[PDB]
Amino acid sequence: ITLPKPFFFEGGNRAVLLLHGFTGSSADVRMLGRYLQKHGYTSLAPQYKGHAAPPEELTKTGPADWWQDVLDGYEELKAKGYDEIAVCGLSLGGVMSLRLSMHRPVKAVIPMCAPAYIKSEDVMYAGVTEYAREFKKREGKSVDEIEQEMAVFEPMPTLKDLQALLKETRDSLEDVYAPTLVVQARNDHMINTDSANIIHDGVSALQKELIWYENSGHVITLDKEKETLHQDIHEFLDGLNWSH
């Protein structure tokens, strides 16, 4: 199985930190990164600990690890000399983008299909087992091989910390001052889509907008309205107060 690695795509002086989703990878934001590169923007996509790896590694990690990966990616951009950084993320990546805007200076925040409601731990964990099965099926494992491995698959007690991160972020949205573009797929079966209104309504940012994508599902970057999303993000980024 060929695992996605992190990326850094050079464009101009203007930088965007691209954050993937829970069980996702840099693959979730690679086409957006390429689009941005072609239009003047530099991007860097980190990957979270336990992701782009066998699923048994994922259950040994938690949001304390993933949050440090976000900060490490932000810091890598500033270490390369990019002092103006917008932050854009998919699902959990959108939550990490909002949290990052509360902790570090960012030019803008673009949460895409970010969850702002709290699902039961067993529903979250069921998403991790679906993920593990689909990984093992991409490994060409037999249905017996997959069932044997899933029968010893360990719990993930850090999902309760992931619930806490969602709740803290929802409860602290007034702390977001940076210009905010909320992106939300209409046909999202993975989160409560009202989260888009919670986030849009909750941030203190004067400069904010909510765009609904009427023919897309949760993984909006990979779906049929990705082209429109790219242009919408591009126009938003171009209207920001960049030094040059």
Author numbering: 3 to 246
What does the paper say about this structure?
Sequence and phylogenetic analyses showed that EaEst2 belongs to the Family XIII group of carboxylesterases. EaEst2 has a broad range of substrate specificities for short-chain p-nitrophenyl (pNP) esters, 1-naphthyl acetate (1-NA), and 1-naphthyl butyrate (1-NB). Its optimal pH is 7.0, losing its enzymatic activity at temperatures above 50 °C. EaEst2 showed degradation activity toward bis(2-hydroxyethyl) terephthalate (BHET), a polyethylene terephthalate degradation intermediate.
The crystal structure of EaEst2 has been determined at a 1.74 Å resolution in the ligand-free form. The structure was refined to an Rwork of 19.6% and an Rfree of 21.3%. The asymmetric unit of the crystal (space group P212121) contained one EaEst2 molecule and 169 water molecules. The overall structure of EaEst2 comprised seven β-strands and 10 α-helices and adopted a classical α/β hydrolase fold in the core domain, which was a twisted β sheet surrounded by α-helices and a cap domain. Three putative catalytic residues, S93, D190, and H220, were located on the β4-α4, β6-α8, and β7-α9 loops, respectively. Notably, the substrate binding pocket of EaEst2 was covered by a cap domain comprising α2-, α5-, and α6-helices, forming a long and narrow shape. Additionally, our sequence analysis revealed that EaEst2 possesses a conserved pentapeptide, GLSLG, in its amino acid sequence from 91–95, including a catalytic Ser residue, which is a typical consensus motif in carboxylesterase Family XIII enzymes. Unlike most carboxylesterases, which are thought to exist as dimers in solution, the functional unit of EaEst2 was determined to be a monomer by size-exclusion chromatography. Collectively, the EaEst2 enzyme can degrade BHET into MHET by cleavage of the ester bond and cannot utilize MHET as a substrate. As a result, we investigated the possible interaction mode between EaEst2 and BHET using computational docking simulations.
